[PDB]
Amino acid sequence: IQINQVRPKLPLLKILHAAGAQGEMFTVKEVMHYLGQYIMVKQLYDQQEQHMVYCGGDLLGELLGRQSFSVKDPSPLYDMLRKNLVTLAT
Ligand SMILES: [Mg+2]
Ligand SMILES: [Mg+2]
Ligand SMILES: [Mg+2]
């Protein structure tokens, strides 16, 4: 297996699939692409303040353990990725 591949855990993979991803293993860039598409297409960001993501009530909020987060202050999102990505480079 390639060193730059990661395997998203079940609930994260569900999100990525729900945004148009195919398969089980991805680069971190691909994961971010599909996660971004999920947020963008469902329009979870506040249209009036687009760095704010209102994720509570959605699977993404469940996974994050937060009602909302800011894209400018990504640590809660990065916490979620740390816990939901299986990697070989770590
Ligand atoms: Mg794909
Ligand atoms: Mg695959
Ligand atoms: Mg961090």
What are the structural domains, with CATH classification, of the chain? Answer: 1-90 (1.10.245.10)
DSSP 30-69: HHHHHHHHHHHHHT-EETTEEEEEE-TTSHHHHHHTSSEE
Residue 74 CA to ligand 3 center (angstroms) comes to 7
The one-letter code for the residue type at 83 is: K
Ligand nearest to the CA of 82: 3
| Resolution stated for this PDB structure, in Å | 1.4
Experimental method: X-ray
Residue 67 buriedness (CB in 10 A; 0-12 / 13-18 / 19+): exposed
Question: Which positions ≥6 away from 47 have C-beta within 8 Å?
Answer: none
Ligand nearest to the CA of 6: 2
Beta bridge partners of 15: none
Distances (CA, A) of 53 to 11, 40, 48, 50, 87: 18, 10, 11, 7, 26
